[PDB]
Design a protein around this ligand. Structure first.
Ligand code: GTP
Ligand code: GTP
Ligand code: MG
Ligand code: MG
Lengths: 37, 182, 37, 182
């Protein structure tokens, strides 16, 4: 249990951060497109 | 923010198939025109966006790239219901990844819309010396399922453009005949 | 092992997605500030 | 992108202490002026940004909010080396979270800059009926360590503004005397 590949975090934990990562990337691409000024 | 959109269509696409067949590399070739040889396996899901033109209309492609590894199955499942086209990717140098296509097909049938557009990619078709899946056999599989097939290479950049435009064109054509007939 | 709180993902897996989440949020706040036009 | 910056200083702050003491809620009160009663424990780390004015200069505050739970310790560790000020937060209704402050202090001494600015927050100071840690005892702890202390409430909005500005003002004052003396 000194092993780097020990499973440690839950489905809920990873899926939450992923969903936020998607939401942020989506919002960033929108405000980047909003720059044709 | 409710602002005027800069596309006429929005196509949600999904890449599925076993870990390591090259789903991410195929998408990064389509969206950045680059190829990295180092393996960075996809943690759960990611996406890329590209807007293309078809029949003079702006087609936004929101392309969802799933993890192939078993532990991400519940995570990637959530992304099937909304897809409009799906790339089923195998690795021509790996027979298992091709046998597993018919499991991926059953997965689609369980989770996606009944009428989703499907295509088979036999990827890494630049590695002739290690080929395990003949081109003829990929063709008969896809014929057995009545869906289109092609051999791709993200590295040599073979059929990547053609795969997405073809799938995009087939989604659009079926959608237009639905919209017109309503 | 039908348990929702079963540990499943590695340190590497979670920390990678978190670091990307931070990078995206950071970039989004920058391009949002870039909008004083 | 190399563009002119809109701040004169950049202060990297860190909130540490046990899970559930209210670190996130204190930051969300500082950065959004809101309070949600439902517990959403922090997965690893998050951050918020607020720019304040001190002595007529623009101070960007990049405030890193760590998870208190043990399984995130390696993840939160990476964020100690760069911090310039650190909020050590306990819960006035929970004696353990206050006993654990001296472990959090030893954690700082192991991982942060030798001269990092530290402050103690006794949070939830709006829940008098459940108080376990007298105000006098938080004060003597912080006096024992020669650092500043205050009782905060993210819910009743007590001393949240004052905590960050004070820490910001103390970082700035020490930095200015360094910059001037160089
Ligand atoms: N020679 C060659 N190698 C490829 C090609 N496509 C992918 N690879 C290599 O195969 C490995 C796996 O590719 P990925 O795109 O990361 O695989 P994947 O399907 O996204 O895998 P998961 O995210 O784990 O499901 C990588 O090291 C790639 O460099 C290709 O067309 N030709
Ligand atoms: N009454 C009262 N409740 C508070 C206060 N601050 C936080 N809470 C409640 O306490 C619970 C824990 O607060 P969080 O801010 O999420 O705790 P945390 O320190 O960030 O915990 P971790 O992210 O797990 O380390 C939440 O349900 C809050 O609503 C406060 O000042 N007063
Ligand atoms: Mg991948
Ligand atoms: Mg928190």
């Amino acid at each position: 249990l000194t092993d780097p590949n020990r499973p440690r975090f839950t489905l809920q934990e990873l899926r939450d951060v992923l969903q936020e990562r998607n939401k942020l990337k989506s919002q960033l691409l929108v405000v980047q497109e909003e720059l044709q000024c | 923010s409710h602002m005027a959109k800069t596309y006429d269509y929005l196509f949600k696409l999904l890449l599925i198939g076993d870990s390591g067949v090259g789903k991410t590399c195929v998408l990064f070739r389509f969206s950045e025109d680059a190829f990295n040889s180092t393996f960075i396996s996809t943690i759960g899901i990611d996406f890329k966006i590209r807007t293309i033109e078809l029949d003079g209309k702006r087609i936004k492609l929101q392309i969802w790239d799933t993890a192939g590894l078993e532990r991400f199955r519940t995570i990637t499942t959530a992304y099937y219901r909304g897809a409009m086209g799906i790339m089923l990717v195998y690795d021509i140098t790996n027979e298992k990844s091709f046998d597993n296509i018919r499991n991926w097909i059953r997965n689609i049938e369980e989770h996606a819309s009944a009428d989703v557009e499907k295509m088979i990619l036999g990827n890494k078709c630049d590695v002739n010396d290690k080929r395990q899946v003949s081109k003829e056999r990929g063709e008969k599989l896809a014929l057995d399922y009545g869906i289109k097939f092609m051999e791709t290479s993200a590295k040599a950049n073979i059929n990547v453009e053609n795969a997405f435009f073809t799938l995009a064109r087939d989604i659009k054509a079926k959608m237009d005949k639905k919209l017109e007939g309503n």
